[PDB]
Design a protein around this ligand. Structure first.
Ligand SMILES: C[C@H](C(=O)SCCNC(=O)CCNC(=O)[C@H](O)C(C)(C)COP(=O)(O)OP(=O)(O)OC[C@@H]1O[C@@H](n2cnc3c(N)ncnc32)[C@H](O)[C@@H]1OP(=O)(O)O)c1cccc(Oc2ccccc2)c1
Ligand SMILES: C[C@H](C(=O)SCCNC(=O)CCNC(=O)[C@H](O)C(C)(C)COP(=O)(O)OP(=O)(O)OC[C@@H]1O[C@@H](n2cnc3c(N)ncnc32)[C@H](O)[C@@H]1OP(=O)(O)O)c1cccc(Oc2ccccc2)c1
Lengths: 358, 357
């Protein structure tokens, strides 16, 4: 099995969102990932590409046999991932204390939104709820409108799965000294708060307000925002540093003498009006030619369906095909122990066959 | 040093955005983090530089480089976030570093990657997510896309994939005795970060139309709503039973409403939910739905977060200097991280060297 996590053995109690995204990445990087679903949802070969790099097995964990088979896998594994409400694994007999009795090397990885304790710990939720409570959602979107969710990117994945992964891998490093596993408590409300540490830093020093649409990186700066072009498509401008901004103005045909200063915020209305009219006078792909190879920090805003035609995407193999759709290749990349292309979701397997193999 | 990464040694060449963020999280979890900045630069007021020692050094001088390679020889990980070719010309490239330490994890944090047509282009978060479909998908349908701050390229698809790479490569080192190079590009990371949308598009469950999807704000049951006081709630009631619970708490009879997932009637459903949420203030709904599975939460501004019980009681934040900062994540039962040490003035690079033998 290819990649730097070759050898690593992972048990995943089937959930939704961050739990499987984490499991996928471990898979992506060479880990041996075994997913226990419930047969209650059996079916044929899954069409969810997030379940790549897996072996799937069914097992009614509510039964005595289910529980014991599961506990044999955990016994022989390095990592467990579960993303159910607190108390679910305990009451199933798969809690941390029950796992520590059959394998004190286990990394016990607990993926939730609200955490293991506190008032909201039994409330159902999704990404949008977790980022609503810690200031993040409020900061996303235009100033003249209600906040808009950044898909489920910030809570489920950036602040969720990815902190789970770091916790797992940090704990595997720990286990090299101590010879013991431990419990990783990854809460989306905490992880996403560390994801936005920069804004908490800038806020402390007067450089970020709570006003939506009025900061350097939320769309309030005319030099860090998207612009509509003549064809109704969009470019992104990220020309923060004055040298890059100067390069952008030159490409737009605007002389600096005629514009307000780049960071005179009181005249950002004028500046935006000027840049807006300039970008609107040619089409996205024009701006794409003008600015390729430039430090102007102007890029086309591509839709998913167009990404496969972008030279830089094609050449670094950021994507692969698998069943009428592109999918991202593992990240990050490794010089000596390279990941390989993901294997598609495999038809189910017998939980015994797996214990054998292991 | 408290945390699971006690005894990890990390050298950080100072940059902006992802590299410093990764270095911070490494520090957070108890790594020994030494940050080389350039003298052209007392105490730094960027709290992102917590859990570090800062040293200066002209990496262009002969003596700055020599000192630097003596750190790197003593360390486990090096982090750099410059354009490709830069460390090479300093004589700090992966090959020069492998001579003084073949165990080093050499961690390269870029936006566009190490090679290819855009590899020398300047850029920021908004550019990396523009190229791979992400930015286009964020915002209302009747408007131009809105950047999700720099959360998705710099951090989610950036620093966090550098970390996964640094730590996976440490695992691999345990069985091979050898370091290696980690190439973390924000355009790659952020694509994996959004793998769920690519999965969903492949099965016809996501479109390229902005504002018309389950999770982009087009669903009336996954969106924010303005309340009587001008403040907002978030609704995330995807599962039908959570949805049902929400409708009951709004005073809405499900018989009067279009189906939850009849997309042609979403405009109409949204208008009914909009009127309901508008008839009371945010804190009213916060109360009403506490302990509920309705998936309705108040949308708090940064300055209100210190007053939310769930936040206070889990110590998600600590007070520092100007204000609150996020405590380390994730959390560890046995080897628990400690409260971050503030950014502490420059020390001399030789001091560190004696400290590390
Ligand atoms: C964008 C969006 C997201 O944000 S992702 C999810 C975000 N939240 C979390 O993950 C945080 C922690 N988890 C939970 O808070 C809950 O999981 C729950 C999901 C809220 C509700 O779940 P609920 O149904 O109450 O389940 P529970 O966890 O409390 O307990 C369920 C248990 O089931 C039983 N059993 C588990 N495994 C087995 C087994 N093998 N055999 C037998 N029983 C099993 C346990 O007994 C327990 O049940 P109990 O005893 O209490 O009755 C998001 C992301 C991705 C997808 C998505 O939705 C879509 C759906 C379809 C298509 C597309 C998207 C939404
Ligand atoms: C939201 C936002 C973000 O997205 S942050 C993410 C930005 N993107 C990346 O990080 C990707 C990789 N890096 C780059 O693409 C470039 O680094 C560059 C950032 C374009 C700047 O290009 P440039 O200034 O030309 O620098 P370079 O990398 O090409 O090489 C410069 C080098 O400086 C020299 N030297 C380094 N260390 C030393 C030393 N110790 N002593 C002496 N010299 C040193 C190197 O030798 C090299 O020089 P060369 O030989 O080539 O001349 C974001 C987040 C946070 C902040 C922010 O914006 C601000 C910007 C300014 C002020 C405040 C905020 C933006």
């Amino acid at each position: 099995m290819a990649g730097p996590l070759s050898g690593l053995r992972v048990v995943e109690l089937a959930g939704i969102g961050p739990g499987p995204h984490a499991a996928m990445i471990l898979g992506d990087l060479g880990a041996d990932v075994v997913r226990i679903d419930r047969p209650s949802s059996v079916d044929g070969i899954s069409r969810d590409a997030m379940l790549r790099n897996r072996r799937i097995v069914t097992a009614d964990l509510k039964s005595d046999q289910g529980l014991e088979l599961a506990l044999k896998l955990i016994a022989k594994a390095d990592v467990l991932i579960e993303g159910y409400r607190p108390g679910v694994t305990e009451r199933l007999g798969l809690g941390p204390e029950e796992c520590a009795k059959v394998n004190d090397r286990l990394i016990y990885a607990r993926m939730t939104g609200w955490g293991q304790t506190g008032p909201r710990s039994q409330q159902a939720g999704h990404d949008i709820n977790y980022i609503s409570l810690n200031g993040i959602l409020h900061a996303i979107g235009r100033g003249d409108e209600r906040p808009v969710p950044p898909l489920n990117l910030v809570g489920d994945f950036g602040g969720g799965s990815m902190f789970l992964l770091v916790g797992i891998l940090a704990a595997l490093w720990e286990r090299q000294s101590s010879g013991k596993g431990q419990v990783v408590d990854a809460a989306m409300v905490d992880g996403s708060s560390v994801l936005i540490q920069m804004m908490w830093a800038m806020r402390a020093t007067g450089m970020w307000t709570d006003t939506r649409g009025a900061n350097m990186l939320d769309g309030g700066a005319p030099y860090y925002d998207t612009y509509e072009c003549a064809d109704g498509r969009y470019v992104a401008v990220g020309a923060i540093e004055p040298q890059f901004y100067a390069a952008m103005l030159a490409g737009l045909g605007l002389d600096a003498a005629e514009l307000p200063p780049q960071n005179d915020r009181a005249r950002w209305p004028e500046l935006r009006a000027l840049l807006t009219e300039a970008f609107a006078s040619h089409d996205r792909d024009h701006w794409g030619a003008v600015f390729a190879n430039s430090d102007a920090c102007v890029t086309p805003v591509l839709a998913f369906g167009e990404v496969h035609n972008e030279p830089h995407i094609i050449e670094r193999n950021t994507f692969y095909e698998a069943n009428g759709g592109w999918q991202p290749m593992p990240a990050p990349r490794f010089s000596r122990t390279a990941s390989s292309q993901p294997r598609p979701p495999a038809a189910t397997i017998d939980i015994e066959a797996v214990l054998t193999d292991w």
